[PDB]
Design an enzyme around this catalytic site. Structure first.
Site, short mmCIF file in Angstrom:
data_model
loop_
_atom_site.label_atom_id
_atom_site.label_comp_id
_atom_site.label_asym_id
_atom_site.label_seq_id
_atom_site.Cartn_x
_atom_site.Cartn_y
_atom_site.Cartn_z
N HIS A 41 16.22 27.78 59.47
CA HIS A 41 17.19 26.98 58.70
C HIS A 41 17.92 25.92 59.57
CE1 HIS A 41 20.15 30.37 59.38
NE2 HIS A 41 20.87 29.32 59.80
N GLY A 143 27.77 28.63 63.08
CA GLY A 143 27.35 28.29 64.44
C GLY A 143 26.81 29.49 65.21
N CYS A 145 24.46 31.56 64.11
CA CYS A 145 23.06 31.81 63.80
C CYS A 145 22.18 31.65 65.03
CB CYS A 145 22.57 30.94 62.65
SG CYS A 145 23.52 31.17 61.13
C1 LCU Z 1 28.45 30.40 57.37
C2 LCU Z 1 27.87 31.51 58.22
C3 LCU Z 1 28.70 32.41 58.88
C4 LCU Z 1 28.15 33.45 59.60
N1 LCU Z 1 26.83 33.66 59.71
C5 LCU Z 1 26.02 32.79 59.10
C6 LCU Z 1 26.48 31.70 58.35
N2 LCU Z 1 25.58 30.82 57.71
C7 LCU Z 1 24.95 31.12 56.56
O1 LCU Z 1 25.10 32.18 55.97
C8 LCU Z 1 24.02 30.04 56.04
C9 LCU Z 1 22.88 30.64 55.21
C10 LCU Z 1 22.39 29.78 54.05
C11 LCU Z 1 21.26 28.94 54.67
C12 LCU Z 1 19.88 29.52 54.69
C13 LCU Z 1 20.79 29.64 55.87
C14 LCU Z 1 21.61 30.93 56.01
#
Ligand code: LCU
Ligand code: LCU
Lengths: 304, 304
Positions: A41, A143, A145
């Site tokens: 992603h 951030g 990820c």
């Molecule tokens: C905002 C945040 C905070 C902590 N951990 C992860 C995240 N990010 C997401 O969940 C984005 C998702 C939707 C897109 C397909 C990707 C994954």
């Protein structure tokens, strides 16, 4: 003396963390040998995330669109491929800090350490467990990820998790290092509900053994039970069913303390039926389920 | 999303851990620049430990009696001195992995990470707090002496603790990196009782702010209180007195959530008077006191 929620030393994993940028999105990558692993992603914009077609999105990306930075130095990208939900960026340089490693897909109930990172840099390390509903209760912000979950056996790092998502409930979802999600989650900005978060029974029993070893014995009772009797109680309290396999791995703890596994199950049964009555076990007022029988043995013996 | 008991990344400290042997005793040392720091009780035998005269015991020790091993390589000892309860072993080689560092003596209530080690090798990392009675509730077995406590500010490691003792109650005692014990403890095999382990009030308040930020709000009430009213309740429940200094450092959390500090004190007051009623806050059934207001800010913002 003392029992703590302990993480593995994070140094070997810190030496692998890099920052991956694609377009305007920046997340973390794991650099092992000449390959950088990151969530796919990274190629998405906020509009793409609603219903992304990753194969179509990846067609518009070239090697030069993936910016990989290790410390303050830029890595040259000479190849890129998509494996399930992870991107593998072939770089022209092997990571000189690459530890001995394996990629392992863990089972629910298993524990691991997470090195939380932002912009390729470590912020902290904590101990997690793959929940029975295949989510993890982590601590991740935007951030984070690409941060990874791992275990260490002397000098070998077994990578088991890569962070990808935060579900609308604040729990976390991710993949193994082959890009396959744990659970039914998909990398898309769509509401995905988690299943029942049951308690990891074998882990609670292992932690009751850790408590007996460290001096907390008030919960030990004059009773015993059977696997079938215990499991009727465990089903009622949303605890995972206990099997002879779980009893087998509790054997060294049972042997060390002289407390038979079924006797400990009867202590756990009374704890479930009567509560703690304002008391604590290893400084906790609830039954801790994120220590495996292996974690208890390791910590209680001093394995390095 | 999510809040975890998080330790600092341990890599910078792992690169400093060495094994120090003197006679038949082996413990851990901290190698920074050309000096190895370790507990002075490394020179003691089991008979010495009852009432040791360290100055007298050190007279019979030469540079060649201190065996320092970093990984599988032996360091040459060219000098040795005693500073309070630590020995400083001057070696002929600066540790190439020496990070930027400071030695700081922390105050009770402050938190830090411990890299538990055995035979100069890391076993795990966990987050601790200097208790108000100057003990730490760690996880240390025989051979863990010399393991250190630290904090990290971007690239600088502030070493604050070195493990020396296990009290007969299973709690831990140790020194700062200048060899001065926290609390009244002495490095001797004599029963030393700990004082009242009071709860770190400011840390509990910081953790209630972390809970509000992360979604757990059930404990928020329609009440407020005063410093003096709150402190009458805090004294009754063995909580540390709250000062305007503590209120000041909670300011950024108070500002982020829009919940005045005194309002949060009233929520804490009702939690103390009524209990949790079988409920949890950040997955805990008790009031967590080992997150400082600084830890909450760092974790909730993603400082690396
Ligand atoms: C905002 C945040 C905070 C902590 N951990 C992860 C995240 N990010 C997401 O969940 C984005 C998702 C939707 C897109 C397909 C990707 C994954
Ligand atoms: C046995 C153990 C377990 C964990 N941490 C530390 C220890 N060791 C000790 O307490 C020995 C003390 C007595 C002698 C003067 C030195 C310190």
């Amino acid at each position: 003396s003392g029992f703590r929620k302990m993480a593995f030393p994070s140094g070997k994993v810190e030496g692998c963390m890099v920052q991956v940028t694609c377009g305007t999105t920046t997340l973390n990558g794991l650099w092992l040998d000449d390959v950088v692993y990151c969530p796919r992603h990274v190629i998405c914009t906020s509009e793409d995330m609603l219903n992304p077609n990753y194969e179509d999105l990846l067609i518009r990306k070239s090697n030069h669109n993936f910016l990989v930075q290790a410390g303050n130095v830029q890595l040259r990208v000479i190849g890129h491929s998509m494996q399930n939900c992870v991107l593998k960026l072939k770089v022209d340089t092997a990571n000189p800090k690459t530890p001995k490693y394996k990629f392992v897909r863990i089972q629910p109930g298993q524990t691991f350490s997470v090195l939380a990172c932002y912009n390729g840099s470590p912020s902290g390390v904590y101990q997690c467990a793959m929940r029975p509903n295949f989510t993890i209760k982590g601590s991740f912000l935007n951030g984070s990820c690409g941060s990874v979950g791992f275990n260490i056996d002397y000098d070998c790092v077994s990578f088991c998790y890569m962070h990808h998502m935060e579900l609308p409930t604040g729990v976390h979802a991710g993949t193994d290092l082959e890009g396959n999600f744990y659970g039914p989650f998909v990398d898309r900005q769509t509401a995905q509900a988690a299943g029942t978060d049951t308690t990891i029974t074998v882990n609670v029993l292992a932690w009751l053994y850790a408590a007996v070893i460290n001096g907390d014995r008030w919960f030990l009772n004059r009773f015993t039970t059977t696997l079938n009797d215990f499991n009727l109680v465990a089903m009622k309290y949303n605890y995972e069913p206990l099997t002879q396999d779980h009893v087998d791995i509790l054997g060294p703890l049972s042997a060390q303390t002289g407390i038979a596994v079924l006797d400990m199950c009867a202590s756990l049964k009374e704890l479930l039926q009567n509560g703690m009555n304002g008391r604590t076990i290893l400084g906790s007022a609830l039954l801790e389920d994120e220590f495996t029988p292996f974690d208890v043995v390791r910590q209680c013996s001093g394995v390095t």
